[PDB]
Amino acid sequence: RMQDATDTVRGLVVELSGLNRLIMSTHRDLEAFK
Amino acid sequence: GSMRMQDATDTVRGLVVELSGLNRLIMSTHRDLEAFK
Amino acid sequence: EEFVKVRKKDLERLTTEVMQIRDFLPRILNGELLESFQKLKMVEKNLERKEQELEQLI
Amino acid sequence: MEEFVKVRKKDLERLTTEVMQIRDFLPRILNGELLESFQKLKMVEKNLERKEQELEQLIMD
């Protein structure tokens, strides 16, 4: 039986989604300063 | 069975390359700031 | 909600790279970047102020 | 052969989307401008220190 790695991938999406929030908020902070 | 799954391995391989390069940028930038501060 | 297949080792590589971003990105992207930009504008204005102050005194 | 695992197609598409957004925006923060700002801050701090020490050593009142 082929293993189902869907839940692993869903966890990576949650992780990268949070990292993208941090990137966007940091970028907008530096954008607003200058 | 008669129906088979699409192989998305090459897509994943491209993502690995993308993220590997982003990690190179993170590590180099972090070390630059580390070396100065 | 169909499935695709991926070589197990390649998905393992992807997980490793994602976890490295998790590990180190917050050690750069934090409040210290904006703080550095703000402090620089503050000290620059204080320098120019004290430069003119010393000029009017000597 | 090397073993396969299976993943719901739509969840892999989401992962791709998130990876590409990092690609798009991370280099617009991580570049030489961060280090340059820290280097510039340390330089002006020393020049302000040396300008305050000149005012402190001056007898003017």
Author numbering:
A (entry chain B): 540 to 573
B (entry chain D): 537 to 573
C (entry chain C): 22 to 79
D (entry chain A): 21 to 81
The publication says:
MEILB2 (meiotic localiser of BRCA2; also known as HSF2BP) was recently identified as a meiosis-specific interacting partner of BRCA2.
Here, we identified an optimised construct for crystallography, which includes the α1 helix and the beginning of the α2 helix of MEILB2 (amino-acids 22–81; herein referred to as MEILB2α) and the core of BRME1’s MBD (amino-acids 540–578; herein referred to as BRME1MBD). Crystals of this MEILB2α–BRME1MBD complex diffracted to a resolution limit of 1.50 Å, enabling structure solution by molecular replacement of ideal helical fragments using ARCIMBOLDO_LITE45. The MEILB2α–BRME1MBD structure contains an unusual β-cap at its N-terminal tip. At this point, there is a slight ‘kink’ in the MEILB2 chains, between α1 and α2 helices, where L50 and N51 adopt non-helical conformations due to a single amino-acid insertion into the heptad repeats. The hydrophobic core of the four-helical bundle comprises highly conserved BRME1 amino acids V548, L555 and I562, which occupy the ‘a’ positions within the heptad repeats.
